[PDB]
Short mmCIF file of C-alpha atoms and ligand atoms in Angstrom, two decimals:
data_model
loop_
_atom_site.label_atom_id
_atom_site.label_comp_id
_atom_site.label_asym_id
_atom_site.label_seq_id
_atom_site.Cartn_x
_atom_site.Cartn_y
_atom_site.Cartn_z
CA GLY R 778 22.06 -11.46 -41.14
CA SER R 779 22.37 -14.03 -43.92
CA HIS R 780 19.55 -16.07 -45.49
CA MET R 781 20.64 -19.60 -46.48
CA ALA R 782 19.39 -20.41 -50.05
CA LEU R 783 17.08 -23.31 -49.02
CA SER R 784 15.28 -21.18 -46.36
CA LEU R 785 14.13 -18.46 -48.81
CA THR R 786 10.42 -17.97 -49.37
CA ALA R 787 9.32 -17.34 -52.99
CA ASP R 788 9.21 -13.53 -52.26
CA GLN R 789 12.70 -13.50 -50.63
CA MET R 790 14.10 -15.42 -53.67
CA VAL R 791 12.50 -12.90 -56.14
CA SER R 792 13.75 -9.92 -54.00
CA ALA R 793 17.34 -11.36 -53.85
CA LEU R 794 17.41 -11.97 -57.64
CA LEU R 795 15.89 -8.58 -58.57
CA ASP R 796 18.49 -6.89 -56.26
CA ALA R 797 21.30 -8.92 -57.92
CA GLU R 798 20.36 -7.70 -61.47
CA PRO R 799 23.24 -6.20 -63.49
CA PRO R 800 22.74 -2.77 -65.18
CA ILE R 801 21.97 -2.28 -68.91
CA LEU R 802 25.31 -1.20 -70.43
CA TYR R 803 25.99 1.12 -73.38
CA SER R 804 28.25 0.40 -76.37
CA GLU R 805 31.48 2.48 -76.23
CA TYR R 806 30.47 5.45 -78.48
CA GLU R 807 32.39 -5.73 -89.80
CA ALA R 808 35.65 -5.44 -87.76
CA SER R 809 34.17 -2.42 -85.89
CA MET R 810 30.87 -4.30 -85.19
CA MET R 811 32.84 -7.33 -83.80
CA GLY R 812 35.07 -4.99 -81.73
CA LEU R 813 32.03 -3.18 -80.23
CA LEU R 814 30.25 -6.51 -79.46
CA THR R 815 33.40 -8.08 -77.85
CA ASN R 816 34.00 -4.92 -75.71
CA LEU R 817 30.35 -4.92 -74.56
CA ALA R 818 30.55 -8.70 -73.69
CA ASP R 819 33.85 -8.01 -71.71
CA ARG R 820 32.13 -5.24 -69.69
CA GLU R 821 28.98 -7.35 -69.05
CA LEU R 822 31.20 -10.23 -67.72
CA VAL R 823 32.53 -8.06 -64.81
CA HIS R 824 28.88 -7.36 -63.79
CA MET R 825 27.99 -11.05 -64.35
CA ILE R 826 30.54 -12.13 -61.67
CA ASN R 827 28.92 -9.67 -59.16
CA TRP R 828 25.49 -11.05 -60.12
CA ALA R 829 26.57 -14.77 -59.87
CA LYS R 830 27.97 -14.14 -56.33
CA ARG R 831 24.46 -12.93 -55.31
CA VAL R 832 22.56 -15.92 -56.83
CA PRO R 833 21.36 -17.98 -53.77
CA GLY R 834 23.50 -21.07 -53.20
CA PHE R 835 26.34 -19.98 -55.57
CA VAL R 836 28.69 -18.84 -52.71
CA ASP R 837 27.96 -22.20 -50.92
CA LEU R 838 30.03 -23.94 -53.63
CA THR R 839 33.86 -24.09 -53.69
CA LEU R 840 35.73 -21.53 -55.83
CA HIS R 841 36.62 -24.32 -58.36
CA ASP R 842 32.91 -25.36 -58.63
CA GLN R 843 31.86 -21.69 -59.06
CA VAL R 844 34.37 -21.30 -61.94
CA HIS R 845 33.12 -24.53 -63.62
CA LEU R 846 29.49 -23.27 -63.54
CA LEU R 847 30.39 -19.76 -64.84
CA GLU R 848 32.73 -21.16 -67.56
CA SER R 849 29.90 -23.41 -68.84
CA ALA R 850 27.10 -20.76 -68.53
CA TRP R 851 28.61 -17.28 -69.37
CA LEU R 852 27.50 -17.23 -73.09
CA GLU R 853 23.99 -18.61 -72.32
CA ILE R 854 23.67 -15.84 -69.61
CA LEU R 855 24.79 -13.07 -72.02
CA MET R 856 22.36 -14.47 -74.66
CA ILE R 857 19.29 -14.74 -72.32
CA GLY R 858 20.03 -11.13 -71.21
CA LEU R 859 20.18 -10.02 -74.90
CA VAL R 860 16.92 -11.79 -75.90
CA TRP R 861 15.16 -10.31 -72.77
CA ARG R 862 16.23 -6.71 -73.79
CA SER R 863 15.23 -7.34 -77.44
CA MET R 864 11.64 -8.48 -76.69
CA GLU R 865 10.02 -5.08 -77.48
CA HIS R 866 12.13 -4.67 -80.72
CA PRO R 867 10.85 -7.20 -83.37
CA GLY R 868 13.44 -8.07 -86.03
CA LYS R 869 16.25 -6.46 -83.98
CA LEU R 870 18.76 -7.37 -81.27
CA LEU R 871 19.22 -4.59 -78.65
CA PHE R 872 22.88 -5.24 -77.80
CA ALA R 873 22.83 -1.80 -76.17
CA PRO R 874 20.33 1.15 -76.28
CA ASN R 875 22.87 2.77 -78.72
CA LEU R 876 23.53 -0.55 -80.53
CA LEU R 877 20.28 -1.98 -81.96
CA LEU R 878 21.19 -4.31 -84.88
CA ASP R 879 18.87 -5.73 -87.57
CA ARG R 880 19.16 -9.31 -88.99
CA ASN R 881 20.84 -7.97 -92.24
CA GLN R 882 23.62 -6.26 -90.19
CA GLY R 883 24.58 -9.73 -88.87
CA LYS R 884 25.16 -10.95 -92.48
CA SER R 885 28.29 -8.69 -92.66
CA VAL R 886 30.17 -11.35 -90.57
CA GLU R 887 30.37 -14.99 -91.83
CA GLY R 888 28.38 -17.47 -89.69
CA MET R 889 26.85 -14.67 -87.54
CA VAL R 890 23.43 -14.57 -89.35
CA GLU R 891 22.38 -18.10 -88.14
CA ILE R 892 23.09 -17.08 -84.49
CA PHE R 893 21.25 -13.69 -84.94
CA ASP R 894 18.18 -15.58 -86.38
CA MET R 895 18.12 -18.03 -83.43
CA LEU R 896 18.38 -15.10 -80.94
CA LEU R 897 15.55 -13.20 -82.77
CA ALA R 898 13.35 -16.38 -82.69
CA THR R 899 13.99 -16.77 -78.93
CA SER R 900 13.16 -13.06 -78.34
CA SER R 901 9.91 -13.56 -80.40
CA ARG R 902 9.02 -16.67 -78.26
CA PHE R 903 9.51 -14.73 -74.94
CA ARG R 904 7.46 -11.78 -76.34
CA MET R 905 4.52 -14.13 -77.36
CA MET R 906 4.62 -15.84 -73.92
CA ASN R 907 4.66 -12.37 -72.23
CA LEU R 908 7.71 -13.35 -70.11
CA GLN R 909 7.81 -11.33 -66.84
CA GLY R 910 10.95 -9.79 -65.23
CA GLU R 911 10.53 -11.96 -62.07
CA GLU R 912 10.38 -15.12 -64.31
CA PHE R 913 13.41 -13.95 -66.37
CA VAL R 914 15.66 -13.62 -63.24
CA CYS R 915 14.61 -17.16 -62.15
CA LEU R 916 15.49 -18.58 -65.62
CA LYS R 917 18.87 -16.83 -65.68
CA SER R 918 19.71 -18.29 -62.17
CA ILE R 919 18.63 -21.76 -63.36
CA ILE R 920 21.04 -21.49 -66.39
CA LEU R 921 23.91 -20.64 -63.96
CA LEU R 922 23.28 -23.62 -61.66
CA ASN R 923 22.28 -26.08 -64.41
CA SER R 924 24.65 -25.57 -67.40
CA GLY R 925 27.71 -27.15 -65.78
CA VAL R 926 25.85 -29.34 -63.20
CA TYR R 927 26.57 -32.66 -65.05
CA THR R 928 30.16 -31.72 -66.05
CA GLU R 929 25.81 -34.05 -51.10
CA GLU R 930 27.38 -31.08 -53.02
CA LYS R 931 25.54 -32.08 -56.25
CA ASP R 932 22.36 -32.55 -54.13
CA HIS R 933 22.69 -28.94 -52.82
CA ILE R 934 22.65 -27.50 -56.44
CA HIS R 935 19.60 -29.66 -57.25
CA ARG R 936 17.84 -28.53 -54.02
CA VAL R 937 18.59 -24.84 -54.89
CA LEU R 938 17.24 -25.50 -58.44
CA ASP R 939 14.04 -26.94 -56.78
CA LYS R 940 13.74 -23.65 -54.77
CA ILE R 941 13.92 -21.60 -58.00
CA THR R 942 11.28 -23.88 -59.63
CA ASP R 943 9.01 -23.34 -56.56
CA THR R 944 9.56 -19.56 -57.03
CA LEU R 945 8.57 -19.74 -60.75
CA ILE R 946 5.42 -21.74 -59.80
CA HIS R 947 4.51 -19.23 -57.02
CA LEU R 948 4.83 -16.32 -59.54
CA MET R 949 2.58 -18.16 -62.05
CA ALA R 950 -0.02 -19.03 -59.34
CA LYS R 951 -0.12 -15.35 -58.19
CA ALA R 952 -0.43 -14.29 -61.90
CA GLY R 953 -3.67 -16.36 -62.02
CA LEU R 954 -2.63 -19.54 -63.89
CA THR R 955 -4.32 -22.87 -62.94
CA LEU R 956 -2.04 -25.70 -61.59
CA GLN R 957 -2.23 -27.24 -65.18
CA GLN R 958 -1.25 -23.90 -66.89
CA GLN R 959 1.62 -23.51 -64.34
CA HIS R 960 3.12 -26.88 -65.39
CA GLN R 961 2.67 -26.11 -69.15
CA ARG R 962 4.30 -22.64 -68.82
CA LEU R 963 7.20 -23.98 -66.69
CA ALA R 964 7.79 -26.75 -69.32
CA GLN R 965 7.66 -24.20 -72.23
CA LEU R 966 10.28 -21.99 -70.47
CA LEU R 967 12.60 -24.90 -69.61
CA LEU R 968 12.39 -26.13 -73.25
CA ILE R 969 13.45 -22.62 -74.39
CA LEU R 970 16.51 -23.10 -72.09
CA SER R 971 17.59 -26.13 -74.25
CA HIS R 972 17.45 -23.79 -77.34
CA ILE R 973 19.55 -21.22 -75.40
CA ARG R 974 22.13 -24.00 -74.74
CA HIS R 975 22.03 -24.76 -78.52
CA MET R 976 22.72 -21.10 -79.36
CA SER R 977 25.64 -20.95 -76.89
CA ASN R 978 27.15 -24.16 -78.38
CA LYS R 979 26.85 -22.65 -81.93
CA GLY R 980 28.24 -19.34 -80.53
CA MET R 981 31.28 -21.09 -78.90
CA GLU R 982 31.93 -22.98 -82.17
CA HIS R 983 32.12 -19.59 -83.99
CA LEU R 984 34.41 -18.10 -81.26
CA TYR R 985 36.94 -20.98 -81.40
CA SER R 986 37.09 -20.77 -85.26
CA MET R 987 38.55 -17.19 -85.29
CA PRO R 988 36.98 -16.20 -71.67
CA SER R 989 38.75 -19.25 -70.19
CA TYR R 990 38.62 -21.22 -66.89
CA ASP R 991 41.78 -19.22 -65.81
CA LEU R 992 40.31 -15.77 -66.64
CA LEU R 993 37.07 -16.64 -64.82
CA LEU R 994 38.93 -18.10 -61.80
CA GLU R 995 40.91 -14.81 -61.46
CA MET R 996 37.79 -12.57 -61.93
CA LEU R 997 35.74 -14.66 -59.37
CA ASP R 998 38.62 -14.44 -56.90
CA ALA R 999 39.32 -10.65 -57.56
CA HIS R 1000 35.65 -9.96 -56.52
CA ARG R 1001 36.79 -10.49 -52.86
CA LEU R 1002 38.87 -7.29 -53.25
CA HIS R 1003 36.07 -5.01 -54.57
CA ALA R 1004 34.69 -2.37 -52.14
CA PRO R 1005 31.23 -3.11 -50.54
CA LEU C 899 -6.02 -39.05 -76.11
CA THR C 900 -6.29 -39.27 -72.32
CA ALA C 901 -2.93 -39.21 -70.39
CA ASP C 902 -3.12 -43.10 -70.11
CA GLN C 903 -3.85 -43.54 -73.88
CA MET C 904 -0.85 -41.21 -74.64
CA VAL C 905 1.48 -43.37 -72.39
CA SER C 906 0.07 -46.63 -73.94
CA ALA C 907 0.68 -45.30 -77.52
CA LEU C 908 4.25 -44.21 -76.60
CA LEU C 909 5.13 -47.53 -74.87
CA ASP C 910 3.73 -49.48 -77.89
CA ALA C 911 5.89 -47.34 -80.28
CA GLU C 912 9.18 -48.29 -78.47
CA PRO C 913 11.98 -49.52 -80.84
CA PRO C 914 13.84 -52.81 -80.14
CA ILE C 915 17.24 -53.14 -78.42
CA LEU C 916 19.71 -53.95 -81.22
CA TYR C 917 22.90 -56.02 -81.09
CA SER C 918 26.35 -54.97 -82.29
CA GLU C 919 27.89 -56.81 -85.24
CA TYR C 920 30.87 -59.27 -84.99
CA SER C 921 36.95 -51.27 -85.08
CA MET C 922 35.15 -49.62 -82.11
CA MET C 923 34.20 -46.58 -84.32
CA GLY C 924 33.06 -48.94 -87.13
CA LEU C 925 30.86 -50.99 -84.73
CA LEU C 926 29.37 -47.82 -83.17
CA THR C 927 28.63 -46.18 -86.59
CA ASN C 928 26.99 -49.41 -87.91
CA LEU C 929 24.86 -49.71 -84.74
CA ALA C 930 23.79 -45.99 -85.01
CA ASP C 931 22.87 -46.58 -88.76
CA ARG C 932 20.66 -49.59 -87.80
CA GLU C 933 19.02 -47.76 -84.86
CA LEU C 934 18.12 -44.82 -87.20
CA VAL C 935 15.85 -47.03 -89.38
CA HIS C 936 13.94 -48.08 -86.20
CA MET C 937 13.89 -44.45 -85.00
CA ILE C 938 11.94 -43.37 -88.16
CA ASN C 939 9.33 -46.16 -87.46
CA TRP C 940 9.08 -44.97 -83.83
CA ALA C 941 8.75 -41.28 -84.90
CA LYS C 942 5.82 -42.17 -87.23
CA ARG C 943 3.98 -43.67 -84.19
CA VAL C 944 4.42 -40.59 -81.92
CA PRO C 945 0.91 -38.98 -81.72
CA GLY C 946 0.86 -35.81 -83.81
CA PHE C 947 4.07 -36.63 -85.79
CA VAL C 948 2.12 -37.94 -88.87
CA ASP C 949 -0.11 -34.78 -88.68
CA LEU C 950 2.96 -32.74 -89.79
CA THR C 951 4.01 -32.37 -93.46
CA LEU C 952 6.78 -34.68 -94.78
CA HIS C 953 9.20 -31.66 -94.90
CA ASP C 954 8.43 -30.81 -91.20
CA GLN C 955 8.89 -34.49 -90.19
CA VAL C 956 12.33 -34.56 -91.90
CA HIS C 957 13.36 -31.26 -90.24
CA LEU C 958 12.46 -32.56 -86.76
CA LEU C 959 14.23 -35.93 -87.26
CA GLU C 960 17.34 -34.28 -88.82
CA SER C 961 17.61 -31.93 -85.78
CA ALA C 962 16.81 -34.59 -83.10
CA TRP C 963 18.36 -37.92 -84.29
CA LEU C 964 21.60 -37.75 -82.24
CA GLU C 965 19.79 -36.48 -79.08
CA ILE C 966 17.30 -39.44 -79.48
CA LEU C 967 20.13 -42.00 -79.93
CA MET C 968 21.90 -40.51 -76.88
CA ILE C 969 18.82 -40.47 -74.56
CA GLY C 970 18.16 -44.12 -75.62
CA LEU C 971 21.79 -45.05 -74.83
CA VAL C 972 21.75 -43.25 -71.45
CA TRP C 973 18.41 -44.99 -70.52
CA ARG C 974 19.97 -48.48 -71.37
CA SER C 975 23.14 -47.67 -69.39
CA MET C 976 21.35 -46.66 -66.11
CA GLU C 977 21.90 -50.04 -64.34
CA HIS C 978 25.63 -50.13 -65.48
CA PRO C 979 27.61 -47.43 -63.51
CA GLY C 980 30.82 -46.37 -65.28
CA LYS C 981 29.72 -48.05 -68.54
CA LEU C 982 27.75 -47.28 -71.72
CA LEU C 983 25.49 -50.12 -72.86
CA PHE C 984 25.67 -49.54 -76.65
CA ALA C 985 24.33 -53.07 -77.12
CA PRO C 986 23.96 -56.15 -74.79
CA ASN C 987 27.18 -57.45 -76.51
CA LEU C 988 28.85 -53.99 -76.52
CA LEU C 989 29.17 -52.56 -72.99
CA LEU C 990 32.07 -50.03 -73.03
CA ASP C 991 33.95 -48.48 -70.08
CA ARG C 992 35.18 -44.84 -69.97
CA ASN C 993 38.82 -45.93 -70.78
CA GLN C 994 37.67 -47.72 -73.99
CA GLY C 995 36.41 -44.33 -75.29
CA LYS C 996 39.97 -42.88 -74.90
CA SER C 997 41.09 -45.11 -77.88
CA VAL C 998 39.44 -42.51 -80.24
CA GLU C 999 40.51 -38.81 -80.10
CA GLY C 1000 37.82 -36.46 -78.71
CA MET C 1001 35.48 -39.39 -77.84
CA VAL C 1002 36.32 -39.47 -74.06
CA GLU C 1003 34.64 -36.06 -73.36
CA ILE C 1004 31.38 -37.30 -75.00
CA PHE C 1005 31.56 -40.69 -73.13
CA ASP C 1006 32.03 -38.80 -69.78
CA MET C 1007 29.01 -36.55 -70.47
CA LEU C 1008 26.87 -39.62 -71.39
CA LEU C 1009 28.01 -41.47 -68.20
CA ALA C 1010 27.12 -38.37 -66.08
CA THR C 1011 23.64 -38.23 -67.71
CA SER C 1012 23.12 -41.96 -67.05
CA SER C 1013 24.17 -41.40 -63.39
CA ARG C 1014 21.68 -38.44 -63.10
CA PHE C 1015 18.73 -40.56 -64.47
CA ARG C 1016 19.70 -43.47 -62.13
CA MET C 1017 19.75 -41.10 -59.03
CA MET C 1018 16.35 -39.59 -60.04
CA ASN C 1019 14.97 -43.15 -60.53
CA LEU C 1020 13.67 -42.23 -64.03
CA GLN C 1021 10.68 -44.42 -65.00
CA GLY C 1022 10.03 -45.96 -68.44
CA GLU C 1023 6.76 -43.97 -68.86
CA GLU C 1024 8.67 -40.71 -68.12
CA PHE C 1025 11.53 -41.71 -70.52
CA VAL C 1026 9.13 -42.19 -73.50
CA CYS C 1027 7.54 -38.72 -72.75
CA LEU C 1028 11.05 -37.12 -72.69
CA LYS C 1029 12.07 -38.80 -75.97
CA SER C 1030 8.83 -37.57 -77.67
CA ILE C 1031 9.54 -34.05 -76.27
CA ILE C 1032 13.09 -34.11 -77.84
CA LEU C 1033 11.56 -35.10 -81.22
CA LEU C 1034 9.00 -32.27 -81.24
CA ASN C 1035 11.21 -29.65 -79.57
CA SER C 1036 14.75 -29.89 -81.05
CA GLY C 1037 13.83 -28.50 -84.49
CA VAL C 1038 10.71 -26.51 -83.36
CA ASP C 1039 0.73 -24.18 -82.80
CA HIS C 1040 -0.20 -27.89 -83.29
CA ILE C 1041 3.38 -28.90 -82.21
CA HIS C 1042 3.03 -26.54 -79.15
CA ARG C 1043 -0.39 -28.15 -78.36
CA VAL C 1044 1.19 -31.67 -78.52
CA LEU C 1045 4.09 -30.43 -76.34
CA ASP C 1046 1.54 -29.12 -73.75
CA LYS C 1047 -0.17 -32.56 -73.84
CA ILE C 1048 3.15 -34.38 -73.10
CA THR C 1049 3.74 -32.10 -70.04
CA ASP C 1050 0.19 -32.95 -68.79
CA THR C 1051 1.05 -36.68 -69.33
CA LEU C 1052 4.31 -36.35 -67.29
CA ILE C 1053 2.35 -34.60 -64.45
CA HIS C 1054 -0.44 -37.27 -64.55
CA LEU C 1055 2.24 -40.04 -64.24
CA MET C 1056 3.84 -38.26 -61.24
CA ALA C 1057 0.44 -37.67 -59.53
CA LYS C 1058 -0.50 -41.39 -59.99
CA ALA C 1059 3.00 -42.36 -58.66
CA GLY C 1060 2.08 -40.50 -55.42
CA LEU C 1061 4.08 -37.23 -55.71
CA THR C 1062 2.63 -34.11 -54.03
CA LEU C 1063 1.68 -31.03 -56.13
CA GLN C 1064 5.02 -29.50 -55.11
CA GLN C 1065 7.11 -32.65 -55.94
CA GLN C 1066 5.40 -32.85 -59.36
CA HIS C 1067 6.68 -29.40 -60.53
CA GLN C 1068 10.15 -29.96 -59.01
CA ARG C 1069 10.50 -33.36 -60.81
CA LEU C 1070 9.12 -31.95 -64.10
CA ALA C 1071 11.77 -29.18 -63.95
CA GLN C 1072 14.62 -31.64 -63.13
CA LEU C 1073 13.65 -33.93 -66.06
CA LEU C 1074 13.34 -31.02 -68.58
CA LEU C 1075 16.69 -29.48 -67.47
CA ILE C 1076 18.47 -32.73 -68.46
CA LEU C 1077 17.22 -32.01 -72.05
CA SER C 1078 19.57 -28.98 -72.11
CA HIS C 1079 22.44 -31.45 -71.34
CA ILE C 1080 21.28 -33.91 -74.06
CA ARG C 1081 21.24 -30.95 -76.56
CA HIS C 1082 24.81 -30.01 -75.47
CA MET C 1083 26.08 -33.61 -75.95
CA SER C 1084 24.42 -33.88 -79.44
CA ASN C 1085 26.09 -30.54 -80.46
CA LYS C 1086 29.51 -31.81 -79.23
CA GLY C 1087 28.90 -35.07 -81.17
CA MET C 1088 27.93 -33.22 -84.41
CA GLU C 1089 31.18 -31.20 -84.02
CA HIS C 1090 33.18 -34.48 -83.79
CA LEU C 1091 31.26 -36.02 -86.77
CA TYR C 1092 31.91 -33.04 -89.10
CA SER C 1093 35.69 -33.08 -88.20
CA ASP C 1094 17.60 -39.36 -98.31
CA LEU C 1095 17.39 -42.33 -95.86
CA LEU C 1096 14.87 -40.35 -93.74
CA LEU C 1097 12.77 -39.43 -96.84
CA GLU C 1098 12.61 -43.07 -98.08
CA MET C 1099 11.75 -44.51 -94.61
CA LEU C 1100 9.09 -41.82 -93.92
C1 LVH B 891 25.62 -12.72 -80.63
C2 LVH B 891 26.45 -13.32 -79.50
C3 LVH B 891 25.95 -12.87 -78.13
C4 LVH B 891 26.61 -11.59 -77.71
C5 LVH B 891 27.76 -11.12 -78.28
N1 LVH B 891 28.15 -9.95 -77.66
C6 LVH B 891 27.21 -9.63 -76.69
C7 LVH B 891 27.13 -8.52 -75.85
C8 LVH B 891 26.07 -8.46 -74.96
C9 LVH B 891 25.10 -9.46 -74.92
C10 LVH B 891 25.18 -10.55 -75.78
C11 LVH B 891 26.23 -10.65 -76.69
C12 LVH B 891 28.57 -11.81 -79.34
C13 LVH B 891 28.41 -10.85 -80.53
C14 LVH B 891 29.99 -12.02 -78.80
C15 LVH B 891 30.21 -12.54 -77.45
F1 LVH B 891 29.14 -12.81 -76.68
C16 LVH B 891 31.45 -12.77 -76.90
C17 LVH B 891 32.60 -12.49 -77.65
C18 LVH B 891 33.92 -12.76 -77.05
C19 LVH B 891 35.12 -12.61 -77.62
C20 LVH B 891 36.39 -13.04 -76.97
O1 LVH B 891 36.41 -13.55 -75.85
O2 LVH B 891 37.47 -12.83 -77.67
C21 LVH B 891 32.48 -12.02 -78.97
C22 LVH B 891 31.23 -11.77 -79.49
F2 LVH B 891 31.16 -11.31 -80.76
N2 LVH B 891 27.93 -13.14 -79.64
C23 LVH B 891 28.56 -13.89 -80.74
C24 LVH B 891 28.85 -15.36 -80.53
C25 LVH B 891 29.56 -15.96 -81.73
C26 LVH B 891 29.66 -15.58 -79.27
F3 LVH B 891 27.68 -16.06 -80.37
C1 LVH B 892 28.65 -41.59 -78.56
C2 LVH B 892 27.73 -41.13 -79.68
C3 LVH B 892 26.33 -41.73 -79.55
C4 LVH B 892 26.23 -43.05 -80.25
C5 LVH B 892 27.11 -43.43 -81.23
N1 LVH B 892 26.73 -44.66 -81.75
C6 LVH B 892 25.60 -45.08 -81.07
C7 LVH B 892 24.87 -46.26 -81.19
C8 LVH B 892 23.73 -46.42 -80.41
C9 LVH B 892 23.36 -45.44 -79.49
C10 LVH B 892 24.11 -44.27 -79.35
C11 LVH B 892 25.24 -44.08 -80.14
C12 LVH B 892 28.29 -42.63 -81.74
C13 LVH B 892 29.50 -43.47 -81.32
C14 LVH B 892 28.13 -42.39 -83.25
C15 LVH B 892 26.86 -41.92 -83.81
F1 LVH B 892 25.81 -41.76 -82.98
C16 LVH B 892 26.66 -41.64 -85.14
C17 LVH B 892 27.72 -41.78 -86.04
C18 LVH B 892 27.51 -41.48 -87.46
C19 LVH B 892 28.41 -41.55 -88.45
C20 LVH B 892 28.09 -41.21 -89.86
O1 LVH B 892 26.97 -40.84 -90.21
O2 LVH B 892 29.09 -41.33 -90.69
C21 LVH B 892 28.99 -42.15 -85.57
C22 LVH B 892 29.16 -42.47 -84.24
F2 LVH B 892 30.38 -42.88 -83.84
N2 LVH B 892 28.28 -41.29 -81.06
C23 LVH B 892 29.42 -40.41 -81.36
C24 LVH B 892 29.21 -38.94 -81.68
C25 LVH B 892 28.35 -38.74 -82.92
C26 LVH B 892 28.62 -38.19 -80.52
F3 LVH B 892 30.43 -38.36 -81.95
#
């Protein structure tokens, strides 16, 4: 059977997202650091396509719409994944369990330190808020559906986004927060998403100064040929 | 402040709608320059903004100024589909943006934001809460406390407007997600722009 996105209960949504989670990858072991970080990003992207196809409502969109969303969100998704992993490592970014880099290691590449500092600050914010795994998967799905939303069909994305918000609220209510604390926590998290967008924009600026629609269209389509 | 006193203080702080002078880039830069002076006056009236040090006030305004100009523009343009109401005497269509290189992509994103606010039926009381959120958030414990207060104010407005508990969180989320889009637009604008006034006014 197949659950349509808008029929999922909060528990079914959490179960589907937890099941969709990509694995934690290892680094293949200043030019060497950039090479290792690009290779890791390339490998995470293959898993990100598999994950996006399992995000409720994503497959309901046309292939062209799926590509637009992934093209706009891929760096924000890699970054939220990085900051989540790095939570328990103050002052460091856990790119991989065998690639834990300090702030000073980022200074070896020009313009990279400002991005590393913003990522560290986001990781510190999630740590202080005690972000839960179930909340993290909801936020990452929201980035996917929201980042390219304003760039019937549009109503469907917004209704799926409402379902994910209901899921975040349900998690917070079960965790013991009052209705007021639920709204404050949801707002805090969504405001952090605007900083994640900021980081991706600064990241993309750096990339273009030295992962296209075409590459993503081919990878999203090639997924149909993978074994079940 | 109660939620109603917060809304009253924000509505009272609202800057005026300015007119364009009597070429498109020149008129738009001059209008932005004039709106900035009013934006500083508005910022000083946002509860909690004067509680911050002068250096913190400057940091927040420096990080948020383009997002604030853009949200203001998008709010004004709501009742004008396919157009950006820069001023009552300067209503520009999408095609008029194509006269300047790289400007069309920004105009399209602003038009899409205006269309989203129109479809959500964004209220004036909600708009002033969002604009205060951008100011305190873009360059971000006291600030976090004020941010928590603005969320409570948005919820209070929605509850008084007759939304259910469920509709309140869904609407709060939809309004705050648009702030990620406003951030994106401001970053794209800063990119285009790069390719003392604040201290004196404060
Ligand atoms: C710190 C970020 C985020 C990040 C990166 N690598 C990750 C791996 C796993 C998880 C997160 C990341 C890295 C280091 C990065 C990246 F995400 C993508 C590429 C792609 C290259 C290409 O297409 O030719 C290159 C990179 F260096 N960025 C840097 C930028 C400037 C993008 F913000
Ligand atoms: C569409 C935007 C937003 C905008 C603008 N003017 C507004 C007036 C009133 C309300 C909104 C706006 C304008 C046209 C704009 C601006 F906001 C600032 C300057 C500053 C120049 C300087 O300091 O030398 C120049 C501008 F053209 N931008 C273009 C961007 C920056 C995104 F590229």
